[PDB]
Amino acid sequence: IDPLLTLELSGVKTYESQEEAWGARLYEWLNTYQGEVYGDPSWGNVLPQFKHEPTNLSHVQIAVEAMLLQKLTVDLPDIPISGLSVAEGDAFDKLKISIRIRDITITQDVVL
Amino acid sequence: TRQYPLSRYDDRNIADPILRAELRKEVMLMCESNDKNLTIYYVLPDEQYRPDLLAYRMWGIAELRWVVTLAAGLEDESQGMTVGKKLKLPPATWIREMIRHFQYDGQVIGTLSIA
Amino acid sequence: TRQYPLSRYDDRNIADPILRAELRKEVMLMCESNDKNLTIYYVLPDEQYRPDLLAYRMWGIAELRWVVTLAAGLEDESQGMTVGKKLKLPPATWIREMIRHFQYDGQVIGTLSIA
Amino acid sequence: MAPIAYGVYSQADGVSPYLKVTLTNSQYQVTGYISQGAAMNMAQNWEVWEGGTPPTFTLPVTFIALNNPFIEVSGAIAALTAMISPELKAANVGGQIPERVTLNIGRRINITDVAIQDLSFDLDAPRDSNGYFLKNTVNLQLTGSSIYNSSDIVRAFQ
Amino acid sequence: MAPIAYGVYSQADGVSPYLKVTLTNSQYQVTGYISQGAAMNMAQNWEVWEGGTPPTFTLPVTFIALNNPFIEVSGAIAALTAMISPELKAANVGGQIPERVTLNIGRRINITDVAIQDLSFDLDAPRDSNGYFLKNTVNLQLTGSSIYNSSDIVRAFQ
Amino acid sequence: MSKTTPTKDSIRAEFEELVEKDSFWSKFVGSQFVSMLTLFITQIVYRCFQYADAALAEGFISTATRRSS
């Protein structure tokens, strides 16, 4: 026996465990970039836009986060967004984006 | 329930390969014609695999993929096309109208003189 | 005055035991099918006597009592059903529609091809 | 990264980022200050409750040409009038729209789709040597793109 | 016991319980202060007296973020907008309603069924270090669920 | 005589209904999982089909438009 994972394989069959299921769906949304998926190249995370901006240009960071959230929402209306948090790290080299749909608090380490 | 899957975009809505053939014939005629109502844009490096990627960015629809494929004359997306080639795209509604005419009453096609 | 006692909910509105039988047949087929338009919920300890409590709380109507009874296959409410069993409920309007069809024109039932 | 922005967009103003109003679209960004007189209203129609109405917003914003008027006042008002003005003849009849912009408030309350239905201000404020305005108070009237549900609204704040 | 509540819900505020306004539904509770400007009106229609009209209420309430703004202001306004916003697309088409809340006044005068028909306030009040509001004055407009009779109304007070 | 093949959205629909046979995997339908795998198979079959169609079209004398053709 060998179990499985959720990253583009399977979390659960359908939405039984609601919130973790939506978190999984958003996970395979965010783990893909532009030009790496057929049909809708714009589908997925838009790191190619919000890659490596200066960490202290709060206006551009808020603009990019707003646009990304609105487009992912209009992309997947099933899952609206509750909480997005941007938290710097110990060094200037680490940022964290924490997305929670009211409970999930799943976080990813980004770099600018 | 009453449901049928279909989509009113496919140039291959016409089941005749030969009819589809002259369709692509005149669209090529127009594309490599230098008409001003055509787009003026070159090639992108990543278009080798995805020629319709430009169609998606400037139109949001992949229906232009066969258009660009015949424009570039590609044997396969595995091979690439030279970046910088002159590419021309007509307004989509114009193609929609011509195909609409051709699949309702695409009979005379060439020139109608008098009833 | 003009008055008559009745209610348009009873699955047993159809007086034929055999017809009621295949009705419960396909509803069982759907219930123990893994359809996603079904509810996902387990058993409650007090449901032994009262399987229809869940129907009351999540719908306010006791018409689903026979549905849950066939879903659990209970011999009597004196006996209990295991807590945690997978229970599935479809939208009520769907059952209302199917029974409406079956008691007006529930003739072909299986599949209609062409008039 | 982001397209051009106007108003107090940079941190060089040395002002609290929270108190900044921000609007952003695919090609334009305007940043300003949360001025007094702001208000909002949501309501419904009935006669028997019939239905609801989309959200409404009345936002007055004050803009100051502290250092660069061209980018802080003139460019700002130009972007604002571009956004409110319906561009329905941009040689792209296959998709022309009056355009909608996204609003950020307090850096944490976001309205993804809102329509700038009305704009007004006064031009009588004093100017600079070149002539660009030093101050203005532009009041804006905004509408939601639809009659948003409770599940749509309550879960959109931070 | 009761579901989540917002505003000055706990006694830790050390304020007289009588002067507190309370709204409660199956899943949300909001508690506030009886602010000035409150009014109510009942009337009828005639031309020969035809009929009556349901009760109407105009309640302005002031909210203060004394200690915890997250629960006292932000959560309060979120619950309020959730209640007023008609939730008619909550995947339960068999029963979706705009929802009505029950009102308690002076801990003795109860309105079992009242509809929050209109809400408004201002967001220009000063904030905290995080940015939650310190103060607000939210005006509310409320309607009775029906044209209540004298036997219905007079015998409902304490 | 002639050749025909159903459209992309069609082939997606009958493909999902036939994969809906096994109850343990029938219900992944509606998910971006099945849609991505489905668009992948549809893109590859579209390439083979339509490119064969283009080859047979270019096989004719008056249909040649490419300089090489």
Automatic annotation (TrEMBL), chain A:
It comes from the Viruses. This is Pep44b.
UniProtKB/TrEMBL annotation, chains B, C:
It comes from the Viruses. This is Gp26. It comes from Escherichia phage P1. The lineage of its organism: Viruses, Duplodnaviria, Heunggongvirae, Uroviricota, Caudoviricetes. The gene is 26.
UniProtKB/TrEMBL annotation, chains D, E:
It comes from the Viruses. This is PmgG.
TrEMBL record, chain F:
This is BplA. The gene is bplA. The lineage of its organism: Viruses, Duplodnaviria, Heunggongvirae, Uroviricota, Caudoviricetes. The chain holds residues 1 to 69 of 477 of the full protein.
